[PDB]
Amino acid sequence: HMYLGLDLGTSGVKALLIDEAQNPVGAAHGELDVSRPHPGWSEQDPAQWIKACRTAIEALRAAHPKEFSAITGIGLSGQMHGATLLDAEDRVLRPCILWNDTRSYREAAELDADPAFRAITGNIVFPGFTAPKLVWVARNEADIFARIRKVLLPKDYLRLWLTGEYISDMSDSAGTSWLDTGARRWSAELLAKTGLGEGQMPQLVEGSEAAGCLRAELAAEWSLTASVIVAGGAGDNAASACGMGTVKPGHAFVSLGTSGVLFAANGAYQPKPESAVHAFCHALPRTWHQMGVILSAASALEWYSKIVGATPQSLDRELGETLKAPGSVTFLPYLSGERTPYNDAKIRGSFCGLEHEADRSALTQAVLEGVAFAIRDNLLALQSAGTEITSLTAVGGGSRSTYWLKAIATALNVPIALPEEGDFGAAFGAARLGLIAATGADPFTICTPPQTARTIEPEQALLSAYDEAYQRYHALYPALHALD
């Protein structure tokens, strides 16, 4: 038996093929471009998704033809929030409006101020969510709005091509701002407020349950031996968490990507939009998750490196592998504002405590310390929303810095598990969801954590100094916020 995962990301489509024991067999990539016609716009032709997916599938089938033909289930993963508008004949009315589009800032401000949206979704309405984009379309592209017969998120448009059905999973649809996240059902009240009805939404399923069969023309185009089940799938965050084993309550991963993400799986729906944490359904039934977002994590270090004319890897190499006690320099990483926990668009980044003796390495250190402190601010927000994080697992580019991991562990006083090498991301979670739907296995027995490479324990000697420095970082925000 074989299982295929398709991750439709913003930069490309990843195809991952695994066997019954969840060992990778092969993988292929199809490139994607992003169109930015106007300031704040971010679009993609849904046809490009299919050409990219076709590129990676046949490239995979041509390298593993016998193994590809033994595929019994397919799992999907996608970039969240994207708005794909289809007419009565499933034609694409306009390019998909992606998660990093901000042209709807006015409409999202209007929806966020309507108390129904946080009460029913449990989340802030940001302009990158699906709901504000559809008010945008109704006001600026009204001819396209009148012809809307379905609104699909990207991975679900791919499923429409694969299966011919209109279906979405709970975790991706909680990102539309149309879902009653706690009830795992569409909200008619929220749909009416943006000018749509439930018949223009796809049908909802759990990410791990069976949600369509592969169309026969496609089953023969790649020579599929059996009835191929397509899983519900997940949004990329929830997909990634399924790949990582982050599905039981209190289990968390921190992603040191361009933006920081603190992902915690929950046993119940636990919203806290007042502290700007996200609460979404997970890909597994009767399961939720929280998401703390740090708007500048690795990009804060990229920013500093462009200033001082080095690369992150050289700055990390210059600082070293041994954790140092914080100095007088403090870095607030709010180069783009901050999301969790203040939802503050006006605040900005800052170095404080500058001394003549602070060299380039000392400021590098304060950048890593400061992002670590933002993560600790995120963990505190999650704890105020009923979650206790016991063990934390680290991924993303920044997790390649031993200094950064020791800093984050000492700032949180939790050990951080660093995985063995492999792809345990969105495409692997998608493959796992395909394995779960095809076999009907208990999804919690499939989505296991990876083997741990190294475990970074908190530096007991520096725990107190990190508290002292954390409090400095924390006191800087209300002082600077008073000036905005």
The residue from 191, 216, 244 where one domain ends is 244
455 three-state secondary structure: strand
CA 442 – CA 43 distance, rounded (Å)? 37
Instruction: Tell me: do 240 and 259 sit in the same domain.
Output: no
Of 78, 447, 71, 64, the residue nearest 229 (C-alpha): 71
The Cα diameter of the chain in Å comes to 71
Instruction: Tell me: do 297 and 206 sit in the same domain.
Output: no
Instruction: Tell me: do 280 and 155 sit in the same domain.
Output: no
Q: CA of 359: how far to CAs of 217, 267, 363, 366, in Å?
A: 64, 47, 7, 11
Residues 6+ apart with CB under 8 A from 475: none
CA 285 – CA 333 distance, rounded (Å)? 36
Instruction: Tell me: do 205 and 192 sit in the same domain.
Output: yes
Structure-solving method: X-ray
The residue from 244, 264, 285 where one domain ends is 244
Burial class (CB in 10 A: 0-12, 13-18, 19+), 435: buried
Instruction: Tell me: do 271 and 384 sit in the same domain.
Output: yes
Instruction: Tell me: do 38 and 93 sit in the same domain.
Output: yes
Residues in the chain: 484
CA 434 – CA 439 distance, rounded (Å)? 9
Header resolution in angstroms = 2.8
Residues 232 and 211: beta-carbon distance below 8 Å: yes
Residues 6+ apart with CB under 8 A from 361: 315, 318, 319
Residues 117 and 107: beta-carbon distance below 8 Å: no
Whether the upstream peptide bond of residue 326 has omega within 30° of 0, thus cis, is no
Residues 401 and 298: beta-carbon distance below 8 Å: no
Tokens read off for 110: 């209007």
Residues 394 and 408: beta-carbon distance below 8 Å: yes
The domain tally of the chain equals 2
Residues 6+ apart with CB under 8 A from 187: 120, 121, 178, 179, 180
CA 393 – CA 387 distance, rounded (Å)? 16
CA 186 – CA 293 distance, rounded (Å)? 25
Of 76, 73, 183, 173, the residue nearest 131 (C-alpha): 173
Domain extent for 398: 245-484
- Active site amino acids: 236
Residues 6+ apart with CB under 8 A from 123: 117, 129, 174, 177, 181, 271, 273, 278, 279, 280
CA 25 – CA 2 distance, rounded (Å)? 9
Residues 78 and 153: beta-carbon distance below 8 Å: yes
What b/e sequence results for 244-261 when a residue is b if at least 16 CB atoms lie within 10 Å of its CB, and e otherwise?
A: bbbbebebbbbbbbbbbb
Residues 6+ apart with CB under 8 A from 474: 373, 377
Instruction: Tell me: do 14 and 48 sit in the same domain.
Output: yes
- 440 membership: H or E segment, kind and range: none
Specify the long-range contacts of residues 190-199, CB closer than 8 Å, at least 24 apart. 190/116, 190/117, 190/120, 190/121, 190/131, 193/111, 193/114, 193/116, 194/111, 194/131, 194/134, 194/135, 194/138, 195/134, 195/135, 195/138, 195/145, 196/134, 196/148, 196/151
Instruction: Tell me: do 13 and 61 sit in the same domain.
Output: yes
Tokens read off for 479: 């002082």
CA 285 – CA 457 distance, rounded (Å)? 33
CA 15 – CA 4 distance, rounded (Å)? 7
Per the annotation, where are the binding residues? Answer: 80-81
Instruction: Tell me: do 156 and 259 sit in the same domain.
Output: no
Instruction: Tell me: do 481 and 367 sit in the same domain.
Output: yes
Tokens read off for 225: 């031996």
Residues 370 and 408: beta-carbon distance below 8 Å: no
Of 218, 260, 225, the residue nearest 411 (C-alpha): 260
Tokens read off for 297: 């994590």
Residues 80 and 175: beta-carbon distance below 8 Å: yes
Instruction: Tell me: do 359 and 224 sit in the same domain.
Output: no
Instruction: Tell me: do 184 and 90 sit in the same domain.
Output: yes
Of 260, 251, 46, the residue nearest 154 (C-alpha): 46
Per the annotation, where are the binding residues for substrate? Answer: 80-81
Q: Give the helix ranges, DSSP H, for 285-442.
A: 298-308, 312-319, 360-383, 402-412, 426-439
Residues 6+ apart with CB under 8 A from 16: 4, 5, 6, 7, 24, 27, 423, 427, 428, 430, 431
CA 358 – CA 385 distance, rounded (Å)? 38
The residue from 244, 267, 292 where one domain ends is 244
Q: What HEC string does 70-129 produce? A: CEEEEEEEECCCCEEEECCCCCECCCEECCCCCCCHHHHHHHHHCHHHHHHHCCCCCCCC
CA 385 – CA 271 distance, rounded (Å)? 7
Residue 182: CATH number of its domain:
3.30.420.40
